[PDB]
C-alpha cells in the first residue's frame, strides 16, 4: 500500500539569437512537474531552488504551482531543488539535483541553435508507508499512482 508521484524535472532553454548579449545568451526555466502535468501540489507544499551565487537572491522559494524558476544568463551550473511535502505526506524533504543545460549535448545530425533545449529527468517519488488519513485525502488523485486492487473474484 504505497503511494507514488510520477514527476519530471529539468530545464528548458532558449537561445536569444540577435537579442543575445554577453550578460544573457539564453532564457531558461528550471522546474519540477507531474510527469503527465497533473497537480503535484497534492503532495508538494513548496520547492526551494538553489541557483549559482552569481544570481541575485540565489535561493528561491516557490510555494504554488508552477514549481519553476525562470531566469536568463550565460552559464551552466548545478541546481538543487528541495521538495517540502505537506505534513501528512512526509516529514522529510527530498532534494533533487539538475545540471542546467543551455546547449544540446550528445547530438548527431545537423542542429539549429534556435531549437529549444529540453533536458529533463523522469522520476517517481515513492512514499512507502502512507498514513490512513493521507490515503483518505489523496485517494485516486490523478497526480498519484496507487497499488492495483487485487480481484476478489
Amino acid at each position: 500500500i504505497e503511494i507514488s508521484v510520477p514527476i519530471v524535472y529539468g530545464n528548458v532553454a532558449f537561445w536569444l539569437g540577435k537579442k543575445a548579449s554577453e550578460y544573457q545568451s539564453h532564457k531558461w526555466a528550471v522546474y519540477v512537474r507531474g510527469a503527465t502535468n497533473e497537480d503535484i501540489s497534492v503532495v508538494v507544499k513548496k520547492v526551494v531552488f538553489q541557483l549559482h551565487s552569481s544570481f541575485n537572491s540565489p535561493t528561491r522559494v516557490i510555494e504554488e504551482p508552477p514549481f519553476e524558476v525562470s531566469e536568463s544568463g550565460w552559464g551552466e551550473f548545478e541546481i538543487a531543488m528541495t521538495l517540502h511535502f505537506h505534513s501528512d505526506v512526509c516529514d522529510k524533504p527530498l532534494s533533487l539535483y539538475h545540471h542546467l543545460k543551455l546547449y544540446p549535448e550528445d547530438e548527431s545530425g545537423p542542429l539549429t541553435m534556435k531549437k529549444p533545449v529540453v533536458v529533463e529527468s523522469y522520476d517517481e517519488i515513492v512514499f512507502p508507508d502512507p498514513s490512513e488519513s493521507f490515503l483518505a485525502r489523496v485517494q485516486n488523485h490523478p497526480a498519484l499512482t496507487f497499488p492495483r486492487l487485487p480481484s476478489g473474484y
Binding site: 549559482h52 552569481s54 550565460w74 552559464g75 551552466e76 551550473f77 548545478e78
Partner: peptide
C-alpha cells in the same frame, strides 16, 4: 559552486 559557459 562551478559555473561555466557551454
Amino acid at each position: 559552486a562551478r559555473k561555466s559557459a557551454p
